[PDB]
Every structure is written in C-alpha cells, then in structure tokens.
C-alpha cells in the first residue's frame, strides 16, 4: 500500500484490447488459453487470506459489508450509489479487478508454464480484458445469464500437457468460502436474509421454511434468474419484448440527457428524462438475485427466492457483479461517446465533478504525489488501456445500438431510498384491477413493470430522492383493447422481502403521453388483509 | 470382484451387541445429527472417488442397473439391456439385494474410513456406529417437517463433518449425496465405460442433474445442469388441477397413492409387486408408483413447443432407466421401495409369489448378485426366497417392528381422510394400461384430464383440468390413479355428469404422441376406499392437441 490502480499496462503488442461479450469470448475460447488464465487466477484471488487486500473477498468487501478499510482509507460501505459519480466510481472499482486479476495471471504463468511457453502466455494475458456481460442482448430470443457464469465446473489447459485438459470448480459459478460468512475472524464477519448463514452467494436460493443449512449453500437457479429478466408485461403472455432491453434502447438513444439524469437514480430537489444508467442497473441486480424470502399464503409453484445480487451489502461477493458492473461501464462509454459534451456539465451534478473516489489511489504526476482517484481521471476509459468494441468503432454506433438493442407512453416513479427506513423494496405497476394475492411479477394478471429499491431512524439525504422510468406504450394498447380505450390509472404496490405490500409507502407514479403530457396519476392498491405488511 | 473372488453380498455382517439395526428415515437422521453422518459422507465419497476397473466404486455400483452395460463380479454384461428388474415381479427382490450391495459396501468402506483415520481413543466409538448405522430411507410420501420433499440432505451442496483427532473441529465437505461428479464427461470414459439406449444428452454430463438438461442452451451447461430442487419437489406434489383454485383443498397424488396400496387388501403378489400385466381396482402397484417418482425427482422432458418465459420442463438422470443410478437420490429412493414392500409384506403375509403369472419367476437366479450357498457349499445367485425375510440381510424398519396398521394412517392418510371425509361416501380410481414399448423403448408420460384440454398447455398441475399422471419409466403394463376428488369437482362444474377421462401421451420433446395405445377408464364404487365393487362408468379418450404440438 498503497495500491496504484492504473489498468493493465500498455503493450506495444496489445493496442487497447477491448473488453469482449463474455458469451462471444466464451465461445472463442472453446470452439483455451485465456479462459484458463481467467479461471485459474480468478481461483487464486477467491483462496487468498482475508488479511490480503487483495484476495476476492476484500476487494468485494470495498462495496459494502463487512465495512473493513481498504487499502489504508478506513472503512456505509465505499461504494456510491444515488449520486452522479455512480458511474466513475464504479469504473475504477471494475479495473481494480480487472487489474489484480491480471497480476494474477502473470503470477501463475511464472509459477505454471514451461519457459518455452511463457511468452505465447503472457501474449494472452496481456491481450486479455475483463467480460462484459450484456444482459440486454438476446443470448446467441430471450435475454439470460452469461453461459459461463451457469457452469458448475469448466475445462482448462494445464500448461506443459499438451492435450491435458481437467475440469476444474468455476470461480464465477459462486463465491464459496470455507465457513459460513457468519463466522469469519473479526473484523470479516457477516454479521433481514440470512446471509450470515451462507458459506456460498446464491441465485433465488434463500426461502423460508427449509432447513437452516441449505443456506449454506442455496444453489445458483439461473433458470429463475433469466425468467426475472425477461420480465414484461403480463398480457405478452397471453408477443413479447423483455423491458430491460427496451429500456437499454431507451437509455443508448435518448437525446438531450445531462449527465445528472443519465447517471444516477438521484433526483435533487423532466420525467421524459428519467431514464439513466442507475434504474436499469438496480433491475438487474434484483433480478440477478432475487430479493423476497418468504410468500405470504399457499402456493404449490414457488417463485420466490433470495440471493447476494439484490442485496447492496453483500451483492459484490457474486461473480457476475462484477461482469453486470462491466456492462455498466460499456453502457457509460456509449452513452458518452454519443452525448460527448455531457459530462458533469449540468447544475446539479457539477458539484460532486471533484469528489474523491474513495479508497482508490493513484500516482499524481504533476504533484508526484499519491493522490484519489477523481471522475475527470477517467472520463477516457482508454487511459486505462481497455476499450469496447462498439466505441472503438464510432461511426457506426447508432446502427450498432439498433441491431443490438431496437402515441408514446411512459410510466414516471420517483420515491425514497429510505421510504422503509432504507430496507429495499420492490414498486410493481399494474394497469387494471391487481390480484390481492399476486402482484409481485410477470405472472401477476395486469402487472405492467417494477422499480427495484437498491437499497440496504434512518433517512435519506435532505432534499433528495429517486427516479426511474418505464416503457407503457404496449402495456396501454393493450388495457385500451380490453377496457373500451381507458386510458389506464397506473397502480402500484410497494412489496417487501417477505412478499407483503407496505401500505404506508406512497410513491409518485405517472403515465405521460406524448413533448410528453401527463395523463394519469397512480395509485396505491390494496391487496389480501393476509398479504399486507 | 476383488482379489479375483466373487464379491458375496451378506448384509451388514451379525454382532451380538447390534440386534437388527434399523434403516431410518433420513430427514429424521439427519435432524438428530454426528459420527454416522461422518462416517457416511467420507465412506461414500471414498466410494464415488473409487477408480473405473474398481467393482465396488459407486461408479460400477450404478453400472449393474443399466449403461454402461457393462460386466460385474465375473457376469456378463452386455444384454441393450440391463442386469435390472423392471415390469417383471421380482422388481422388489432384485432391487431389496440390490440396495443391500450398496449399503454393505458403505459400510465396509466405514470401517476402512476408522483404521486410517480416527485415533485409538476413539476407534471402538466409531466402530459401535458404523454397526449400528444403516442406509437411510427417503420417505417421499411423507409430509417434509404441508408438503412432500426431496431429502433436507439431497438439497445441500455441502456438509460439515467431524475432523477424527481434532476434538469439536468441523470441516465442510461436498455432499456425496447432492450429486454424482465424475472428472470428465460421461460420454468420453475410458471404454468401455462410456455413456453413450436414450436421446437426452447424457454423454455430455459429467455430473448427475435434477432438471437440468434443456435444449437450446450451449451444451457445455449439460457437463453440471445442477441439482433444480426447488422443481423436483413441485413435481412430487402433483395434485388435480382445480385443487389450485381457491375454495379447495388439496392433496398429494403421491401420498393417496402411496396409503392406497399400503392400505388395500387382497392383491396377490404379482398385482402388488409390478406393473407388468399379461380387475382395474388392483392396478395399484409398487412399480407404478417408483416409476412416477423418478419421473418427478429427475424431469423427462428436454424441450416444449412454442414460447415459454416460464420454463418448468427440463431433463435429469432419474427419468431415464439406463442412467437413473448414478443420482445419489437412487439408492435412497429404492431404499423407501424396499421398506414399502416390507409393510405391505407385513400386512399381506400368505401373497409371496402366489399367483400363477409371478410363481414362474420366483426361482430366477437375480443376477449379477452372489452368496455363497451354506447347504450346497457354492457360490449361486440370489433367489427372491433368500430376501423374503430382509431381516436374514441383518437390517430393519422401526415400522416393521410392529401398530403397523394404525403407523400406515398417521403417516400418509391423514390428509386423504381429512379432504375426503368432506365429500360423499364413493370413490372413484382411473385405470391406465399400456405398452411400454409402445415409442421402441422410448419413455414417455400419460397425462389424463377431466374437461376440455388446453392445446398448448397439457404438461403437468398447472394444466387446465390435470388429473394424473403415469411415467413409463423405460406384454403390457398396468397403473392406477385416485380420482375421487378430480370427480367431484367436474360433476360440480358439470351438472352431475361422469367425466370422460381424456388422456394425451407426451414425450421428451413435450409433444402429443397420437399412435401410443392407452386404455384409460373410470371406475366408481359406493363407500371410501379407506373405510369396494367397483363399476366402470366412462371410457378414456385421446385429446388432441394444437398442431404445432403434435409430434
Ligand atoms: O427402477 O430404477
Ligand atoms: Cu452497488
Ligand atoms: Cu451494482
Ligand atoms: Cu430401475
Ligand atoms: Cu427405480
């Protein structure tokens, strides 16, 4: 310490490699040098000691929980969330990991590979970047979780075997450590869900009502995670178009954002541009994780189910945060590339330009000193010598976008972080009457969409709030069809983890017609006396 | 086997201070737990560690049931066929020695586990428990401590277990009972142990999977499709389908049936002990029931049709005859057949063998299994009458011991009575006869519905009108369904008319199979079965089904 986080370092041979499609580089590699490299030094950071900085678990620990220092800056976890540097911090938090986990393939090059192989491995590590996962991109008809990250176990080479190939545990199936996260040396302890009683992150693997050890070990139901992110309206299923990727579209082609409205959830004391980077991304990580434990009632079929993803605390221990947090960056850089004189530039978000990028260090070579990492270091992310594709390739990133990607209506939310004392929650929108005893997805009859609460005597900051927004157009054809042309009142319930509707919260929910004009206000619906929290 | 000797399978061997241990319920065991959970998951991880040329590893232990189709402890393998009972009357003798193998080799693997690792302190401890532990039973009929389930332990990917020598010291370990993992995939084994019979892609698995396999996902995702726990217990609790409606309470096919043919008397041996079929109220029989649940824990159906969201197909070792061993839930699935041919046993003394189809087959030799013959001095094969009595294995059930009868209630009858006792006194049973070679071999599910059939939509509980369901797990073959509750709710719905059971065959691709015979009638009799001249009253229809469902 301290650690200078520069990104991987720049190689004549290596002209800003770009960081791939994790399916597209999945396939590459087995249709395996890379691959081996990834899993390989992936394994080594995971089984480094808690008392190294740079072991898997501490450098997820800078997120959130167990709120230890980092790196000297002591230890609310470091991440930023609902402010305008959401998207610059987390760019030096993905090189960081980008970065050890290069050092870590040159660490197992010198330790593994033959001298007579070293230099075509090292020529692969160095071309190498950290996946992105493109979780609004239909997987090589529906939107899913990367291939990889669905494997149990994965093949690699082992170097100086020519055909000696072995199967190895995949270090971005799961995080496991050797105990349950509840009983790690002080101060690493975990200590709402049960994740003190995990030895492993999980996918939808935590419910109530079954034994206490098989959360230890909740298992990774990637099938019910891709269906969470397929979520659509519920008449499609009744043809269908995954919201998440229509709010990508959205998000990559809007224009006239500011960089305070594409940045962040925060809303400081307009609804056409509710749209930003931060609403898509907190979606995702519920849908990823899943976030209610219990469900109220009988039910044969059991949708529920939670797991690390949608927990801010914790949602770092899983592999693919860091792979959905990568996708985030790319969605950044296009955004940027296509909106170049938006940066920081607005009333609202020039304030927070200059905040320190806790606990990130760099080399300051004017003052030659040590200094924070600070947004303007990276608004290039090539100076951190990685690259997209689709940036690399400027010319044609509108059509890029609409192959990837492609009356209005929309729907308006704006609500508290805090609303339930800063527990999250889940805002389901319904157009028409809802089920008091099923209003929680796609399989609700009438449900339209869902703001996830990312969130996890406490109060949000004075003077501020939310924002999301969701597409209405076809969910409004639709209830018209049905319902003799109404335009349809939104109606909303706020869901906790248990599956029960907080009827205290009140949310701001708006349908807008297009200039957008407002057309409806929401409102609250009631649901079963046995379903109410 | 080893050495170059026949393996004999004896049972856990006799000692004085181990009187006839008993096989328990293994969510029970569990609970209470821990050196036997210890010595169980180091003994079978052993096992499934064992090398390929090894006859006692878990690997060949699962080869003697069906592919590879390999030989064994010197027999010939090879028939393709396996050294298996199934649709014949020695299914419950073949599988009780078969399941008795599997425990006598965990045991024996226990007491190599003490020499090498527990101290000399604590050796005669360890000792006393691996002679008192027994293979665990999976009661899947059972309500979990509202509803059925997969084992507590089936659904851990790890365990902790005692350190031997490092006194209150817990290690956790892979679960040798939440998977079978081999280190390659099972297709690419050394010959000639390779799977590679079947059409799901079983030579791309290098583990077993519960609901694992779908089509259209990168086969590199089949090597470990996981353990879908969560599905296979929706599975086992198939119910009617209105009974998801509210105003209605449900209950577990599985269970119904399971007090029904603990229950009913006078079914010979040959009605109870198989499906095999060379009156339609003694249809209810051991083998259909197994079959249902393989069906349940592993999946069958690799596709469906059409555009789903919600995906509740997906395919598992356990569906499939030629693979259904290496699932660790196997053995303990067979071990609850066992106990349930032993109360029935109990309770039908004189019906061993005794009608004139299954007297034909109690004399076969149940290959590959060998004992050494005390009254001839040679090495022979098991015959059923050496396992009539499972006792002479040196095993029991708490529930044999005795009270049987009142056990049979409280176990799986109080949920049929309590739902049952609300409507009039009459029953009504479906009958299903099929061949199970009616798609060459291929497996396939027999849905039966009450009332219009959704075109698109013809799978499983969630289908509108779903009454039942019958697997053929794989001369004819014979399966029973309840229907006493299905009934009502149709006559409710329908002004008092019998319902005409409408059945459609499904296969692995979830489509309609229109060229598989199946006669399915309904029966009705006056009075509950559980307090008996039963009438047919509706013949079975084939559904049809949308076209783009139609195999
Ligand atoms: O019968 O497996
Ligand atoms: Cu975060
Ligand atoms: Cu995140
Ligand atoms: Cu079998
Ligand atoms: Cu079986």
């Not at 301290?2 to 370092?9: N, Q, S």
């Not at 927004?469 to 054809?477: F, G, S, T």
């Not at 939104?490 to 599956?499: K, L």
């Amino acid at each position: 310490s301290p650690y200078l986080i520069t990104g991987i370092p720049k190689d004549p041979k290596h002209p800003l490699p770009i960081r791939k499609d994790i399916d597209d580089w999945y396939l590459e590699q087995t249709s395996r040098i890379q691959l081996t490299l990834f899993v390989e030094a992936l394994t080594v950071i995971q089984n480094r000691p808690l008392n190294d900085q740079l072991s898997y678990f501490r450098l997820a620990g800078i997120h959130g929980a167990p709120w230890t220092e980092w790196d000297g800056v002591p230890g609310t976890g470091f991440a930023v969330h609902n402010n305008y540097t959401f998207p610059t911090w987390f760019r030096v938090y993905v090189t960081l990991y980008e970065q050890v986990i290069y050092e870590a393939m040159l660490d197992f090059i010198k330790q593994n590979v033959p001298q007579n192989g070293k230099a075509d491995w090292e020529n692969e590590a160095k071309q190498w970047r950290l996946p992105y996962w493109d979780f609004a991109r239909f997987a090589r008809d529906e939107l899913r979780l990367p291939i990889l990250v669905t494997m149990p176990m994965v093949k690699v080479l082992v170097p100086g075997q020519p055909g000696k190939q072995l199967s190895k545990p995949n270090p971005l199936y799961r995080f496991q450590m050797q105990t349950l996260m509840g009983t790690l040396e002080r101060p690493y302890a975990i200590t709402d869900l049960p994740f003190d009683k995990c030895q492993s992150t999980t996918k939808y693997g935590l419910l109530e009502n079954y034994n206490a050890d098989v959360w230890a070990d909740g298992g990774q139901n990637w099938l019910r995670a891709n269906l969470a992110l397929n979520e659509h309206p519920w008449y499609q299923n009744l043809d269908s178009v995954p919201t998440l990727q229509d709010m990508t579209f959205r998000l990559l082609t809007t224009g006239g954002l500011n960089w305070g409205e594409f940045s962040s959830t925060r809303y400081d004391d307009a609804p056409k541009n509710w749209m930003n980077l931060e609403a898509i991304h907190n979606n995702v990580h519920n849908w990823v994780g899943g976030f209610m434990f219990s469900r109220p009632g009988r039910h044969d079929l059991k949708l529920w189910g939670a797991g690390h993803m949608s927990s801010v605390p914790v949602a770092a221990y899983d592999p693919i945060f860091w792979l959905h947090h990568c996708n985030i960056d790319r969605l950044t850089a296009i955004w940027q590339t296509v909106n170049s004189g938006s940066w920081f530039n607005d009333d609202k978000s020039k304030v927070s330009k200059d905040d320190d990028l806790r606990p990130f260090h760099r080399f300051c070579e004017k003052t030659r000193k040590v200094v924070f990492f600070r947004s303007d270091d990276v608004k290039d992310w090539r100076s951190l010598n990685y690259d997209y594709a689709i940036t690399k390739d400027a010319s044609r990133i509108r059509k890029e976008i609409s192959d990837l990607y492609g009356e209005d209506y929309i729907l308006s939310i704006r609500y508290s972080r805090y609303a339930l004392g800063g527990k999250p929650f889940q805002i389901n929108i319904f157009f028409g009457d809802v089920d008091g005893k099923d209003f929680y997805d796609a399989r609700s009859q009438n449900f339209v969409g869902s703001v996830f609460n990312f969130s996890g005597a406490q109060q949000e900051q004075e003077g501020v709030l939310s924002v999301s927004q969701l597409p209405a157009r076809l969910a409004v054809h639709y209830y018209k069809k049905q319902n003799k042309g109404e335009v349809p009142t939104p109606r909303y319930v706020v869901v906790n983890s248990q599956g029960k509707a907080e009827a205290e919260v009140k949310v701001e929910v708006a349908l807008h017609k297009t200039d957008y004009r407002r057309v409806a206000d929401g409102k609250r619906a009631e649901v079963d006396d046995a379903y109410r929290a």
